[PDB]
């Protein structure tokens, strides 16, 4: 949903300061524009968990601009698993690519039997309209068993959607569970 | 405990000997190489062992031609 976050133009400030100053250095750009910026760390985190890449995020620039944007990418402190720079894609018109969540309706019959269910790609890749972004994509993951798998070709789509991956790309599989019963062999 | 390893041949001292923008007389070794990491070009000869050297006098001119490999040139004075 619409997730607003104040955006400030970092001019010449050192990124270590802003990251030190609770500010997340980022940069917002498109084929038209490009601007060094920064945000609040805690703000971008709070929204961003709500506002995962799957969703528009309106940056409230200081001038009054309210940018429909998309987190194209985010840098992370590997040594801390902490965001360290944000890639703000200015979601203008002329429909663009992104990742949409997956609404896996139902539970696999095999998973109910005791198997384990793994979501291969918990998000999907689609070049869709800037203002026609379906927040979810449901799937029938109930008619499965241990060893059954789904692919990109079986997902049905809302209007104006373009699956941007291999149609044969498997995304959900039911593998045999993890059991101590097969450990006495290993004990 | 014994060892199979422990031997190594002598250092051959390969590499480029004169650089671009460097005056050279004819007959000077330009590149002491194996194979042709640099190919001979304008006023540049190459002996049997791929050794590039100045054909004429002048200045060294390295020039990479992309897919066409790295060439050397001896631009006369």
């Amino acid at each position: 949903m619409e997730y607003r976050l104040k955006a400030y133009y970092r001019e010449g400030e050192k990124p270590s300061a802003l990251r030190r100053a609770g500010k997340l250095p980022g940069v917002m750009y498109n084929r038209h524009l490009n601007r060094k910026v920064y945000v609040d760390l805690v703000e971008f985190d709070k929204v961003f968990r709500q506002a995962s890449i799957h969703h528009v995020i309106v940056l409230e620039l200081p001038d009054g601009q309210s940018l429909p944007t998309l987190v194209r990418q985010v840098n992370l402190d590997k040594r801390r698993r902490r965001p360290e720079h944000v890639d703000f894609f200015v979601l203008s018109d002329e429909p663009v690519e992104m990742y949409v969540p997956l609404r896996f309706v139902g539970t696999p019959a095999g998973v109910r039997a005791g198997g384990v269910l793994q979501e291969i790609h918990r998000d999907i890749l689609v070049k869709v309209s800037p203002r026609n972004i379906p927040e979810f994509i449901e799937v029938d993951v109930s008619g499965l068993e241990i060893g059954d798998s789904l692919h990109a070709s079986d997902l049905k789509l809302p209007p104006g959607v373009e699956l941007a991956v291999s149609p044969e790309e498997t995304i959900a599989a039911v593998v045999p569970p993890e059991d101590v019963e097969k450990l006495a062999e290993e004990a | 405990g014994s060892t199979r390893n422990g031997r190594d041949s002598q250092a051959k001292r390969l590499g480029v000997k004169r650089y671009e923008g460097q005056v050279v007389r004819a007959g000077n070794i330009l590149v002491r190489q194996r194979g042709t990491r640099f190919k001979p070009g304008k006023n540049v000869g190459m002996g049997r062992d791929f050794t590039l050297f100045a054909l004429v006098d002048g200045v060294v001119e390295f020039q990479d031609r992309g897919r066409l490999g790295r060439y050397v040139h001896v631009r006369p004075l």
Binding site: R49, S52, I53, K78, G114, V116, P177, E178, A187 | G1
Partner: protein, 141 residues
């Protein structure tokens, strides 16, 4: 246990361990993980001990995800031999793990089960670790 089925070079040099985890640093497959916190090696015995510990604590279902592998041949010489006269033998295969390395991804499990399981596995391992969750930070990576 885990060990390369073959390799171009039997022995290998020790090598520095400084720096951050290059690859495998976001929850990719499972729901929870156990990221490293200090650089260190992890032998196949330790990886295996943590694995069997996790599967036992689960004891049913769930899926374990070992995003590391012990390829580097660990080496020690025969006991009470003077230095030199060759390199020691391959005691076993370790796996280098820098900080940020997401060692373990468990999925198909309730939160508490994966949490405690990853905790026990953490105790089995020789490094301070951190249980974590798949996130948009993970989803964005």
């Amino acid at each position: 246990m885990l060990m390369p089925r073959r390799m171009k070079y039997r022995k290998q040099q020790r090598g520095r361990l400084k720096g951050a985890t290059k690859g495998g640093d976001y929850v990719a497959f499972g729901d929870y993980g156990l990221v490293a916190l200090e650089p260190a090696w992890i032998t196949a015995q330790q990886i295996e001990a943590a694995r069997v510990a996790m599967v036992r604590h689960f004891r049913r279902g769930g899926k374990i995800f070992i995003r590391i592998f012990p390829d580097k041949p660990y080496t020690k010489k025969p006991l009470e031999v003077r230095m030199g006269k060759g390199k020691g033998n391959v005691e076993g295969y370790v796996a280098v793990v820098k900080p940020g390395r997401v060692m373990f991804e468990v999925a198909g499990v309730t939160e508490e089960q994966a949490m405690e399981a990853l905790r026990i596995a953490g105790h089995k391992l020789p490094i301070k670790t951190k249980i974590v969750r798949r996130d948009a930070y993970d989803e964005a990576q």
